[PDB]
Design a protein around this ligand. Sequence first.
Ligand SMILES: *C(=O)N1C[C@H](NOS(=O)(=O)O)CC[C@H]1C(N)=O
Length: 264
Amino acid sequence: TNLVAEPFAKLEQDFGGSIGVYAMDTGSGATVSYRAEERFPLCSSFKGFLAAAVLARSQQQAGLLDTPIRYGKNALVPWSPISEKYLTTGMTVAELSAAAVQYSDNAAANLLLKELGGPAGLTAFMRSIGDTTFRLDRWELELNSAIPGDARDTSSPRAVTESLQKLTLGSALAAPQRQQFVDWLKGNTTGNHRIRAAVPADWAVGDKTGTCGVYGTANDYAVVWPTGRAPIVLAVYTRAPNKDDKHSEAVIAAAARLALEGLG
Ligand SMILES: *C(=O)N1C[C@H](NOS(=O)(=O)O)CC[C@H]1C(N)=O
């Protein structure tokens, strides 16, 4: 039996789908795992790892992050509020990266993906840090289709958490670039009702959300710094079997609460 798992199973049954959770206490090595190795659509959440890959490239291409990109109107797609606002100005690669992370800007994500050689390029970066699960296959907006059983544009809660740790706390990025990634995550604007809602207000959080919407499909991943303790890294993903099934932020927050509670 798995008593630790029963509250999660209860939660996803009330929800009407599947919830996937993985949390790592980087001090103790303790973990909390629920459907941790099943695939879930990435939706917008891929944009965190996208920003990381751009940061890694900027270590080896001098002035890359400072480079202005003067994109045209044909680079724009729905829900690109920052990219639209800066259309007549242009944006640096840094600014695009922060827009992708902190506002989930779609156009900014597509412009950066192009710089890396498209979804296959981001996938190759993820492989280079030892992540064999992550895959990005399509661009915005098609990557959000979230069709049950389609492996395209998916990862697992465990692989996400493991890769997040490597990039934010490990050595996969050089220190200045690691700190930039952490700062982008900390300044995220879209995650207030997800993992941030599960966390004491005095603990620092950096996160990135995803919301495909269809098939009850949404997610959040985070690094959490509890006051006086090593950081906790975690990922919460949801999906559901019917196209009209509605995602729930509350369910992502409740799952996060159970992970933090289950840790030692
Ligand atoms: C990503 O899943 N999305 C981008 C945008 N904001 O969502 S997020 O903050 O939950 O990441 C709208 C939904 C979506 C998309 N359809 O591109």
